[PDB]
Amino acid sequence: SHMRVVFSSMASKSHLFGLVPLAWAFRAAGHEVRVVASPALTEDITAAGLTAVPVGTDVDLVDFMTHAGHDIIDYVRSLDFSERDPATLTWEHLLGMQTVLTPTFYALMSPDTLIEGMVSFCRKWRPDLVIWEPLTFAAPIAAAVTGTPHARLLWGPDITTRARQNFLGLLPDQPEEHREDPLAEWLTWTLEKYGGPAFDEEVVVGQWTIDPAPAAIRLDTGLKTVGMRYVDYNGPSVVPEWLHDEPERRRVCLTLQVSIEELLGAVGDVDAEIIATFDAQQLEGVANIPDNVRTVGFVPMHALLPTCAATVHHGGPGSWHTAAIHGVPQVILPDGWDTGVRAQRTQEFGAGIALPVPELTPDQLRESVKRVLDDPAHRAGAARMRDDMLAEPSPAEVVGICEELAAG
């Protein structure tokens, strides 16, 4: 039966992309699909071949970031969960995250304007389901007010959910007066503005969650999960003529430290064809680094990764997930809280190596690339992950699971 599905993302090209194949999945099923977001995300929605419903007005980040926000970029790079230290699990630390990230990021996106914009569209268009990016709190609010079923669609790890579950876990130890919950206080006084229902953790996590990540690398949250076979989307993809041919020698593709990018010479000491995702602009200073190295700029990963014996990347979801589904061993170079956590999970499983960028050494990379290419274990690990993922339903099949869940 025919449905009206709303997809909502915050105005980030980096975030919308994780919803794109499932939006198209619904519309191919014959359902009405609209991507409700802020005017900024409109070009990116239309470039995904999707219908945009731009609601509300844009937010001046440029001014906020130049004067206030920049320090919060310096604050975030500090936090590290991949090791589970007791120091990071203190009430003082956890409430810290909740106090800073709630206004400076979650609520900075999801502004005054967007939430009333979505609540207006939902009241009018009368959707049957709302699928949202995990940090666009406007959508569950709109869905709560309208009484519309809603579900989250994850890309990387659900680190915010784990951080929150821990924060709430400490609330009872603290005295009644010392208790606080910025995200709940915000969403509660927001739900009141539209006369909506009482606050429920259901507005923070969804009614269910869809994760394209294999069961074993997912964090334990207890939330209703619908696993999904990952299908890549990463904006405008154009296949170059050179990527038509089956490779000659074995291939390692390098995608984007403190190594002065002169690290290309380190991966050059590896016995393989290297495909570097760097433009002629990005490698204007490199003069002796190329030998077995090929520089081809930004190319489709879903077309390149099927031809690689191994991969070296920043740890981004697109790179992680695409390599994972193709059973391609990984050498992750993380710099974010979200990337480190996942890089650690994938190394524990044996589908690769996690090389934190602050600690990173050119010797480590040469050894790590040599390790994934020669040890049949990393491939075997990567083979299990791939097999887990291909056993999950395709976005096509997930449409029926949502359809059913949406009913009850």
């Binding site: 906020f64 004067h67 206030a68 320090d71 500090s78 206004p103 007066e177 206080e185 915000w186």
Partner: protein, 337 residues
């Protein structure tokens, strides 16, 4: 009374400033981490603030904790408790102080130029209160006292006003103050909470010291109230703003540029006071900085002095303190007998 729309806008502002205060604070700067008041012990931050002397924060603000420079600015007339200038980070954050802080900064600015009865005639009424303390005795003292020169619950809701001027409170907490906030009466509400924690901290300090305990009963003293307001002042921080550019130790302080005097730090300088972090009732060191026009400080010292003398007879659970009070550091629960 206020719409759920402007409420939403206000809440967002209070949450943004606190978010940025914590971010800036966790990143390094001790003044905004103090402003969050997530800790109950601020004495290490005060050592670091005194050690530096004068330093301007991540926000525009000048932090004066050195007793030498603290007295220097408190005595200078250019530095006043008026509406200064909006720093770029705040307006860029979308939270002008003129909006989230406004009622509360007018309270700080208020002066009570009225006769202050220090008669101790007050201690007569205050006698029959403790049977054979935060709300049952301490908060009872200013109400009955100001009545014999302002409703109980009304003053209790506004009690956060002098913290709210520098540190954003919760939305309901900020909401309840504005609705219960009345000039002189406004300034009297402020003094009521100033007196209230003074009574708690004094009875708490007397309770530990062996002398002060049975000694207060011998001569019902003003010396204990004096020493208590040194280790635990009415206002730990003192928001001021320059009208004309001032030179303080090689530093140019611009017009409308905010300066915050860290009174609690200043009042424990090792070079100015002997055994500063130690409670000494009989100490020659009376060069303690406090509070600017008016006699509100003189009013509270009297209400607290009368109070300490009345409870001299009784003097020989876990203490919970208000968690968003970097200015006045209030107690919420003080058990028991």
């Amino acid at each position: 009374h206020m719409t759920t729309t402007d409420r939403a806008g206000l809440g967002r502002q209070l949450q943004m400033i606190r978010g940025l205060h914590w971010g800036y604070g966790s990143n390094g700067d001790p003044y905004p981490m103090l402003l969050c008041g997530h800790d109950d012990d601020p004495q290490r931050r005060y050592r670091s603030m005194r050690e530096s002397g004068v330093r301007r924060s991540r926000t525009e603000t000048w932090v004066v904790a050195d007793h030498a420079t603290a007295r220097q600015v408190l005595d200078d007339p250019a530095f006043t408790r008026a509406t200064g200038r909006t720093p770029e980070w705040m307006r860029a954050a979308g939270a002008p102080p003129a909006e989230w802080a406004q009622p509360f900064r007018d309270v700080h600015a208020a002066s009570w130029e009225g006769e202050v009865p220090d008669v101790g005639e007050l201690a007569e009424s205050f006698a029959g209160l403790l049977p054979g303390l935060v709300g049952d005795f301490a908060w009872q003292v200013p109400v009955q006292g100001m009545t014999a020169v302002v409703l109980r619950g009304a003053a209790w809701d506004a009690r956060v006003s002098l913290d709210a001027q520098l540190s954003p409170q919760q939305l309901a907490v900020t909401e309840a103050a504005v609705a219960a906030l009345p000039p002189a009466l406004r300034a009297l509400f402020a003094g009521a909470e100033m007196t209230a924690n003074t009574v708690v901290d004094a009875v708490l300090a007397v309770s530990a010291e062996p002398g002060l305990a049975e000694r207060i009963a011998d001569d019902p003293a003003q010396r204990t109230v004096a020493e208590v307001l040194r280790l635990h002042p009415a206002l730990h921080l003192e928001r001021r703003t320059a009208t004309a550019e001032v030179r303080l130790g090689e530093h140019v302080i611009g017009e409308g540029e905010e300066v915050v005097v860290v009174v609690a730090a200043a009042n424990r300088d090792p070079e100015v006071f002997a055994e500063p972090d130690r409670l000494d009732v009989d100490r020659p060191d009376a060069d303690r900085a406090l509070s600017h026009p008016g006699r509100l400080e003189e009013l509270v010292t009297a209400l607290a002095t009368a109070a300490l003398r009345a409870a001299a007879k009784a003097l020989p659970g876990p203490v919970v303190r208000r968690r968003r009070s970097p200015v006045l550091r209030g107690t919420n629960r003080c058990p028991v007998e």
